[PDB]
């Protein structure tokens, strides 16, 4: 197994972020750490994902340099909740693992850890320096918090 680029846990044993996986060894690495679900945010599916039939790919396509749509975030949350309900960890990736990935990660903290948007964005940036760099990305988290209370 080979650790995928920019990989790190946000919620130990439950949720992790990563850059674009592109080799069979990347997916095998995820499976070894218990990450049985991969939420893919890129415009196209990541290469060689089918090498590991045991890993479930969840395609939630979000255009490059754009924020996630409200319904997409709700779906992301649902996916993480159901996976963790089965004792399985989830990994979420985009192209670089900072923008779209960072926004999703922060949104789960808002929902699952009850954090305010600002603090959720700060924690993600602390764990993964460089995350949620754009205003639209921050905006996505704040509006999610607004409809999550």
PDB file of C-alpha atoms in Angstrom:
ATOM      1  CA  UNK A   1       0.000   0.000   0.000  1.00  0.00           C
ATOM      2  CA  UNK A   2       1.111   3.562  -0.735  1.00  0.00           C
ATOM      3  CA  UNK A   3      -0.268   6.567   1.133  1.00  0.00           C
ATOM      4  CA  UNK A   4      -2.131   8.875  -1.306  1.00  0.00           C
ATOM      5  CA  UNK A   5      -0.862  12.471  -1.643  1.00  0.00           C
ATOM      6  CA  UNK A   6      -1.983  15.008   0.970  1.00  0.00           C
ATOM      7  CA  UNK A   7      -3.633  12.321   3.096  1.00  0.00           C
ATOM      8  CA  UNK A   8      -4.605  12.941   6.732  1.00  0.00           C
ATOM      9  CA  UNK A   9      -7.308  12.098   9.252  1.00  0.00           C
ATOM     10  CA  UNK A  10      -9.842  14.722  10.312  1.00  0.00           C
ATOM     11  CA  UNK A  11     -11.808  12.358  12.561  1.00  0.00           C
ATOM     12  CA  UNK A  12      -9.506   9.478  13.621  1.00  0.00           C
ATOM     13  CA  UNK A  13     -10.774   6.241  12.132  1.00  0.00           C
ATOM     14  CA  UNK A  14     -13.831   7.898  10.618  1.00  0.00           C
ATOM     15  CA  UNK A  15     -13.044  10.655   8.126  1.00  0.00           C
ATOM     16  CA  UNK A  16      -9.935  11.532   6.114  1.00  0.00           C
ATOM     17  CA  UNK A  17      -8.985  13.928   3.346  1.00  0.00           C
ATOM     18  CA  UNK A  18      -6.653  13.335   0.410  1.00  0.00           C
ATOM     19  CA  UNK A  19      -5.545  14.615  -2.972  1.00  0.00           C
ATOM     20  CA  UNK A  20      -6.320  12.765  -6.197  1.00  0.00           C
ATOM     21  CA  UNK A  21      -5.610   9.018  -5.835  1.00  0.00           C
ATOM     22  CA  UNK A  22      -4.225   7.623  -9.103  1.00  0.00           C
ATOM     23  CA  UNK A  23      -2.554   4.277  -8.409  1.00  0.00           C
ATOM     24  CA  UNK A  24      -3.816   0.856  -7.295  1.00  0.00           C
ATOM     25  CA  UNK A  25      -1.509   1.073  -4.275  1.00  0.00           C
ATOM     26  CA  UNK A  26      -3.266   4.245  -3.122  1.00  0.00           C
ATOM     27  CA  UNK A  27      -6.651   2.516  -2.841  1.00  0.00           C
ATOM     28  CA  UNK A  28      -5.077  -0.542  -1.254  1.00  0.00           C
ATOM     29  CA  UNK A  29      -3.603   1.824   1.345  1.00  0.00           C
ATOM     30  CA  UNK A  30      -7.066   3.232   2.096  1.00  0.00           C
ATOM     31  CA  UNK A  31      -8.508  -0.249   2.533  1.00  0.00           C
ATOM     32  CA  UNK A  32      -5.673  -1.116   4.932  1.00  0.00           C
ATOM     33  CA  UNK A  33      -6.538   1.845   7.163  1.00  0.00           C
ATOM     34  CA  UNK A  34     -10.202   0.856   7.251  1.00  0.00           C
ATOM     35  CA  UNK A  35     -11.288   3.521   4.743  1.00  0.00           C
ATOM     36  CA  UNK A  36     -13.915   1.482   2.860  1.00  0.00           C
ATOM     37  CA  UNK A  37     -15.628   4.457   1.199  1.00  0.00           C
ATOM     38  CA  UNK A  38     -14.211   7.105  -1.091  1.00  0.00           C
ATOM     39  CA  UNK A  39     -16.146  10.266  -1.866  1.00  0.00           C
ATOM     40  CA  UNK A  40     -14.836  11.607  -5.179  1.00  0.00           C
ATOM     41  CA  UNK A  41     -15.362  15.345  -5.840  1.00  0.00           C
ATOM     42  CA  UNK A  42     -13.376  15.701  -9.085  1.00  0.00           C
ATOM     43  CA  UNK A  43     -14.922  16.350 -12.509  1.00  0.00           C
ATOM     44  CA  UNK A  44     -13.900  12.793 -13.485  1.00  0.00           C
ATOM     45  CA  UNK A  45     -13.514   9.604 -11.481  1.00  0.00           C
ATOM     46  CA  UNK A  46      -9.987   8.986 -10.129  1.00  0.00           C
ATOM     47  CA  UNK A  47      -7.832   6.597 -12.206  1.00  0.00           C
ATOM     48  CA  UNK A  48      -7.515   2.910 -11.314  1.00  0.00           C
ATOM     49  CA  UNK A  49     -10.162   2.962  -8.573  1.00  0.00           C
ATOM     50  CA  UNK A  50     -11.604  -0.295  -9.936  1.00  0.00           C
ATOM     51  CA  UNK A  51      -8.398  -2.093  -8.946  1.00  0.00           C
ATOM     52  CA  UNK A  52      -9.914  -2.441  -5.460  1.00  0.00           C
ATOM     53  CA  UNK A  53     -13.445  -3.854  -5.811  1.00  0.00           C
ATOM     54  CA  UNK A  54     -13.806  -3.706  -2.032  1.00  0.00           C
ATOM     55  CA  UNK A  55     -13.648   0.103  -1.876  1.00  0.00           C
ATOM     56  CA  UNK A  56     -16.967   1.864  -2.582  1.00  0.00           C
ATOM     57  CA  UNK A  57     -16.676   4.960  -4.789  1.00  0.00           C
ATOM     58  CA  UNK A  58     -19.228   7.740  -4.223  1.00  0.00           C
ATOM     59  CA  UNK A  59     -19.182  10.240  -7.092  1.00  0.00           C
ATOM     60  CA  UNK A  60     -20.224  13.752  -6.015  1.00  0.00           C
ATOM     61  CA  UNK A  61     -18.919  15.784  -8.948  1.00  0.00           C
ATOM     62  CA  UNK A  62     -18.226  19.433  -8.268  1.00  0.00           C
ATOM     63  CA  UNK A  63     -16.740  21.657 -11.023  1.00  0.00           C
ATOM     64  CA  UNK A  64     -13.127  22.725 -10.531  1.00  0.00           C
ATOM     65  CA  UNK A  65     -12.810  25.997  -8.633  1.00  0.00           C
ATOM     66  CA  UNK A  66     -16.474  26.027  -7.560  1.00  0.00           C
ATOM     67  CA  UNK A  67     -18.184  25.316  -4.204  1.00  0.00           C
ATOM     68  CA  UNK A  68     -20.387  22.286  -3.389  1.00  0.00           C
ATOM     69  CA  UNK A  69     -24.136  22.645  -3.922  1.00  0.00           C
ATOM     70  CA  UNK A  70     -26.358  22.426  -0.791  1.00  0.00           C
ATOM     71  CA  UNK A  71     -27.834  19.024  -1.739  1.00  0.00           C
ATOM     72  CA  UNK A  72     -24.328  17.652  -2.359  1.00  0.00           C
ATOM     73  CA  UNK A  73     -23.167  18.538   1.147  1.00  0.00           C
ATOM     74  CA  UNK A  74     -26.254  16.853   2.599  1.00  0.00           C
ATOM     75  CA  UNK A  75     -25.446  13.757   0.540  1.00  0.00           C
ATOM     76  CA  UNK A  76     -21.805  13.829   1.662  1.00  0.00           C
ATOM     77  CA  UNK A  77     -22.922  13.959   5.309  1.00  0.00           C
ATOM     78  CA  UNK A  78     -25.365  11.096   4.742  1.00  0.00           C
ATOM     79  CA  UNK A  79     -22.594   8.988   3.216  1.00  0.00           C
ATOM     80  CA  UNK A  80     -20.216   9.541   6.127  1.00  0.00           C
ATOM     81  CA  UNK A  81     -22.948   8.854   8.702  1.00  0.00           C
ATOM     82  CA  UNK A  82     -23.969   5.574   7.029  1.00  0.00           C
ATOM     83  CA  UNK A  83     -20.390   4.389   6.537  1.00  0.00           C
ATOM     84  CA  UNK A  84     -19.412   5.115  10.142  1.00  0.00           C
ATOM     85  CA  UNK A  85     -22.671   3.418  11.204  1.00  0.00           C
ATOM     86  CA  UNK A  86     -21.168   0.266   9.681  1.00  0.00           C
ATOM     87  CA  UNK A  87     -17.883   0.783  11.495  1.00  0.00           C
ATOM     88  CA  UNK A  88     -16.196   1.921   8.277  1.00  0.00           C
ATOM     89  CA  UNK A  89     -14.103   5.042   7.657  1.00  0.00           C
ATOM     90  CA  UNK A  90     -14.560   7.431   4.736  1.00  0.00           C
ATOM     91  CA  UNK A  91     -12.026   9.267   2.619  1.00  0.00           C
ATOM     92  CA  UNK A  92     -12.872  12.384   0.601  1.00  0.00           C
ATOM     93  CA  UNK A  93     -10.783  13.711  -2.287  1.00  0.00           C
ATOM     94  CA  UNK A  94     -10.711  16.383  -4.998  1.00  0.00           C
ATOM     95  CA  UNK A  95      -7.795  17.448  -7.217  1.00  0.00           C
ATOM     96  CA  UNK A  96      -5.441  18.885  -4.585  1.00  0.00           C
ATOM     97  CA  UNK A  97      -7.413  18.003  -1.451  1.00  0.00           C
ATOM     98  CA  UNK A  98      -7.630  21.552  -0.102  1.00  0.00           C
ATOM     99  CA  UNK A  99     -10.565  23.389  -1.692  1.00  0.00           C
ATOM    100  CA  UNK A 100     -13.593  21.194  -2.363  1.00  0.00           C
ATOM    101  CA  UNK A 101     -12.252  18.546   0.009  1.00  0.00           C
ATOM    102  CA  UNK A 102     -11.570  21.096   2.733  1.00  0.00           C
ATOM    103  CA  UNK A 103     -15.086  22.507   2.479  1.00  0.00           C
ATOM    104  CA  UNK A 104     -16.725  19.076   2.840  1.00  0.00           C
ATOM    105  CA  UNK A 105     -14.527  18.157   5.779  1.00  0.00           C
ATOM    106  CA  UNK A 106     -15.386  21.426   7.542  1.00  0.00           C
ATOM    107  CA  UNK A 107     -19.074  20.834   6.925  1.00  0.00           C
ATOM    108  CA  UNK A 108     -18.958  17.448   8.631  1.00  0.00           C
ATOM    109  CA  UNK A 109     -17.377  19.075  11.691  1.00  0.00           C
ATOM    110  CA  UNK A 110     -20.227  21.574  11.747  1.00  0.00           C
ATOM    111  CA  UNK A 111     -22.793  18.759  11.591  1.00  0.00           C
ATOM    112  CA  UNK A 112     -21.093  16.049  13.648  1.00  0.00           C
ATOM    113  CA  UNK A 113     -19.072  18.093  16.130  1.00  0.00           C
ATOM    114  CA  UNK A 114     -21.457  21.029  16.477  1.00  0.00           C
ATOM    115  CA  UNK A 115     -18.843  23.636  15.576  1.00  0.00           C
ATOM    116  CA  UNK A 116     -19.608  27.118  14.278  1.00  0.00           C
ATOM    117  CA  UNK A 117     -18.554  27.633  10.641  1.00  0.00           C
ATOM    118  CA  UNK A 118     -15.628  29.863  11.554  1.00  0.00           C
ATOM    119  CA  UNK A 119     -14.228  27.344  14.021  1.00  0.00           C
ATOM    120  CA  UNK A 120     -14.851  24.428  11.661  1.00  0.00           C
ATOM    121  CA  UNK A 121     -12.890  26.197   8.909  1.00  0.00           C
ATOM    122  CA  UNK A 122     -10.106  27.008  11.368  1.00  0.00           C
ATOM    123  CA  UNK A 123      -9.756  23.406  12.543  1.00  0.00           C
ATOM    124  CA  UNK A 124      -9.552  22.088   8.973  1.00  0.00           C
ATOM    125  CA  UNK A 125      -6.960  24.736   8.121  1.00  0.00           C
ATOM    126  CA  UNK A 126      -5.043  23.749  11.270  1.00  0.00           C
ATOM    127  CA  UNK A 127      -5.041  20.034  10.416  1.00  0.00           C
ATOM    128  CA  UNK A 128      -4.551  20.609   6.683  1.00  0.00           C
ATOM    129  CA  UNK A 129      -2.820  23.998   6.153  1.00  0.00           C
ATOM    130  CA  UNK A 130      -3.997  25.569   2.904  1.00  0.00           C
ATOM    131  CA  UNK A 131      -7.583  24.289   2.992  1.00  0.00           C
ATOM    132  CA  UNK A 132     -10.690  26.341   2.144  1.00  0.00           C
ATOM    133  CA  UNK A 133      -8.689  29.162   0.518  1.00  0.00           C
ATOM    134  CA  UNK A 134     -11.548  30.803  -1.381  1.00  0.00           C
ATOM    135  CA  UNK A 135     -14.429  32.989  -0.242  1.00  0.00           C
ATOM    136  CA  UNK A 136     -17.003  30.814  -2.035  1.00  0.00           C
ATOM    137  CA  UNK A 137     -15.593  27.831  -0.144  1.00  0.00           C
ATOM    138  CA  UNK A 138     -15.934  29.625   3.215  1.00  0.00           C
ATOM    139  CA  UNK A 139     -19.386  30.768   2.119  1.00  0.00           C
ATOM    140  CA  UNK A 140     -20.450  27.169   1.500  1.00  0.00           C
ATOM    141  CA  UNK A 141     -19.536  26.222   5.078  1.00  0.00           C
ATOM    142  CA  UNK A 142     -21.269  29.252   6.611  1.00  0.00           C
ATOM    143  CA  UNK A 143     -24.508  28.675   4.727  1.00  0.00           C
ATOM    144  CA  UNK A 144     -24.388  24.997   5.703  1.00  0.00           C
ATOM    145  CA  UNK A 145     -24.027  26.015   9.345  1.00  0.00           C
ATOM    146  CA  UNK A 146     -27.013  28.312   8.854  1.00  0.00           C
ATOM    147  CA  UNK A 147     -29.233  25.407   7.771  1.00  0.00           C
ATOM    148  CA  UNK A 148     -27.784  23.093  10.416  1.00  0.00           C
ATOM    149  CA  UNK A 149     -27.975  25.507  13.351  1.00  0.00           C
TER     150      UNK A 149
END
